[PDB]
Amino acid sequence: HKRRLSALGPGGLTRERAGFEVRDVHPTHYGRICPIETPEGPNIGLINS
DNA sequence: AAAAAAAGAGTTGACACCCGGGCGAATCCCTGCTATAATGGGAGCTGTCACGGATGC
């Protein structure tokens, strides 16, 4: 829970304003952001660690 | 074979009292008055579309 990287808050894209590109995984996350730990709820692809 | 009374009613004075209405007293709310010089304002998006409609020359 301490190694979490959220994308919301005061200055972040709202869940309704996320879209499809923000939730998608980018090929630069190799070794910097694990694309396997993410909540399977509505805010998918925004709480990656 | 007869014939009157503890209850059952019915009151009659005799307190005990319990909020109500005043008499106070103690204390709240309003309103105005202060005299050196005061002179234009701080967030907020901005990382969804798409449609469906309202103004303009």
The reply to whether A17 has its C-beta less than 7 Å from any atom of strand B is: yes
- Closest by alpha carbon to A41, among A8, A4, A15? A15
Amino acid at A12: G
Residue with tokens 């709480």: A47
Nearest nucleotide over every DNA/RNA strand to the A17 CA, judged by C1': B48
Taking the alpha carbons of A30, A10, A43, A19 in that order, is the dihedral positive or negative? negative
Q: How was this structure determined?
A: cryo-EM
Give Cα A3 distance to the centre of its chain. Answer: 13
Three-state SS for chain A is CCCCCCCCCCCCCCHHHCCCCCCCCCCCCCCCCCCCCCCCCCCCCCCCC
The reply to whether A25 has its C-beta less than 7 Å from any atom of strand B is: no
Rounded Cα–Cα distance for residues A37 and A16 (Å): 21
- Closest by alpha carbon to A48, among A15, A10, A6, A9? A6
